[PDB]
Design a binder for this molecule. Structure first.
Ligand SMILES: CC(C)n1c2c(c3c1-c1c(Br)c(Br)c(Br)c(Br)c1C3=O)C(=O)CCC2
Ligand SMILES: CC(C)n1c2c(c3c1-c1c(Br)c(Br)c(Br)c(Br)c1C3=O)C(=O)CCC2
Lengths: 328, 328
């Protein structure tokens, strides 16, 4: 019969009511800046798609971050540029300041506002209960904004959340995997990092939506309150779904694949098995108990659902009791 | 009430005093040459509307430039051909030598005189004050001629000015966006590159005229005397008008839209803000001061006005003190 279709329960048609130019990024024309305006100071890191440098805008002596792209389809570059320009000025969205043409790689280089990030492997160990609530709220601001603008990030994870902790400042970065949501569109399921892939990606259900990001957020939250980073630590995609099922239980998983008539890859047969849904109390211990509370567990439970349609929206999440004190 | 109409203050009726055939390009019949007269030597570049090749005319062994056109309405090809033929032989106008059509693919190719251009990214950094005055004067010759022939270029920018610096030769090229001026005609505002769009284009005032080109010229001049390319560096069309208003001030802008009863797009409301008119001295520094003079600033100020009717004409511009030494 084929899989049952699905639609986002919020922001479903926002791109259809936009002018064509907003989401038809293949027709976007890039206006290049002057690359001699920037001198590279030092390398900050390397990724699958890019190399990242701290640089100086010599016209005004301002610090910037330059992401020199590795070779990829021009269509994906246009997509990332168009999404960054659509989202510019939104709450906690990284600001694209310029686009130049690297003299060495002859590839594009994206210039971004600078952020003085504290590395998460050292930050998350020091975060208090209130810090986790605060930064979760900031991330939710960014996510609700981009979802309301018809865009899903599809790569939410700690490495893509820059935090200047001294100033309580947060930026959601790396939009190279983001896409425009259109109702009925089938998307590539090979997105996001393995530890943060939603079950819809792991069972190969292509008609997903904004709710994918929410699953990733839950994973992050799980790793923060239980002090286990990453929380679902699978060795591959199959073992990733297995690790998830050992916590969430197999009954809801099979109900999920039955509801959407999903054809389960045969390889799962001999590895999913039968697993009960566990209570979160089994992950609590003396070193993490100060971060775990009834409110946090209720919120986490409402994020980590197999059925993408049953997960909280970003706005619903922002209205949860877990955040009352942050809301002031 | 609607917008207040406008007319060019010079060359207003030149096309109406012409035979219909001069400006009625929709009825133009193309005189085709033989495509086998030309052999392509090498590719020189790629554009939005065309690909550009160096080629050899084998009947007379002469070097030429071939612009193979991408798919476009036949009426626009007729327009470009008719304008090129009307302007052929004019001062510093590129010469159209032939028009051919691949007998198999049926795609059209325009053949042009060859010019040994030095790319502006390397030329403009080496230009002296006198060089800038000289080449501005040459561009003004071309512009006054085409305006006097009832034609506005609508795409003036460095990429469309070919300069053979060894021979002090200059050609204004790429007339694919040019149009005939008719009093009372409303034109498409989606013309020119972002950084060179006049305010009339950005506020959607359709009854513009030759003076549009003058705004573009001012932009070029600014970037050359201040060594700042582009001068108005907007992120999009809206932010482009914002960049302009941060230099020329918002008060003259609102006086402009009041004079012509222009309906401002509501989105400008939250981005234009309040800005004072800046003095040009803020763009002068140790690396460009040898190119900036009182005469240059006076001329520039008289080019970059919101009100298109208050900008210098090409001839008035040619009579400015900035050019006395060039006039000899
Ligand atoms: C972890 C760090 C080295 N980093 C990486 C990336 C990016 C960064 C980074 C930092 Br730090 C800052 Br601050 C800003 Br602002 C911006 Br934008 C970025 C960015 O895009 C990748 O895209 C992949 C490789 C890792
Ligand atoms: C920058 C260069 C490669 N170039 C481009 C174009 C054109 C040229 C060019 C050159 Br050089 C010369 Br010499 C002559 Br003569 C003429 Br006519 C042209 C011309 O029309 C485009 O139209 C768009 C793509 C870039």
């Amino acid at each position: 019969s084929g899989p049952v279709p699905s639609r986002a329960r919020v922001y479903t048609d926002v791109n259809t009511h936009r002018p064509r130019e907003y989401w038809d990024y293949e027709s976007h024309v890039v206006e290049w800046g002057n690359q001699d305006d920037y001198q590279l100071v030092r390398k900050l890191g390397r990724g699958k798609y890019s190399e990242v440098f701290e640089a100086i805008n010599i016209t005004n002596n301002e610090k910037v971050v330059v992401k020199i792209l590795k070779p990829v389809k021009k269509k994906k570059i246009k997509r990332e540029i168009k999404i960054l320009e659509n989202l510019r000025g939104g709450p906690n969205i990284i600001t694209l300041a310029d686009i130049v043409k690297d003299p060495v790689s002859r590839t594009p280089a994206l210039v971004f506002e600078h952020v003085n990030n504290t590395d998460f492997k050292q930050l998350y160990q020091t975060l208090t209960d209130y810090d986790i609530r605060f930064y979760m709220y900031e991330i939710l601001k960014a996510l609700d904004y981009c979802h309301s603008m018809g865009i899903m990030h599809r790569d939410v994870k700690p490495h893509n959340v820059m935090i200047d902790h001294e100033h309580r400042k947060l930026r959601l970065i790396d939009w190279g995997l983001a896409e425009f949501y259109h109702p009925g569109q089938e998307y590539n399921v090979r997105v996001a990092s393995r530890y943060f892939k939603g079950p819809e990606l792991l069972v190969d259900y292509q008609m997903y939506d904004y709710s994918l990001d929410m699953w990733s957020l839950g994973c992050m939250l799980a790793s923060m309150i239980f002090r286990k980073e990453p929380f679902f630590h699978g060795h591959d995609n199959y073992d990733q779904l297995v690790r998830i099922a050992k916590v969430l239980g197999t009954e809801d998983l099979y109900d999920y694949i039955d509801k959407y008539n999903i054809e389960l890859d045969p390889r799962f047969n001999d590895i999913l098995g039968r697993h009960s849904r566990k209570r979160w109390e089994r992950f609590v211990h003396s070193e993490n108990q100060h971060l775990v509370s009834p409110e946090a567990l209720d919120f986490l439970d409402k994020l980590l659902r197999y059925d993408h349609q049953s997960r909280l929206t970003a706005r619903e999440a922002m209205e949860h009791p877990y955040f009352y004190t942050v809301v002031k």
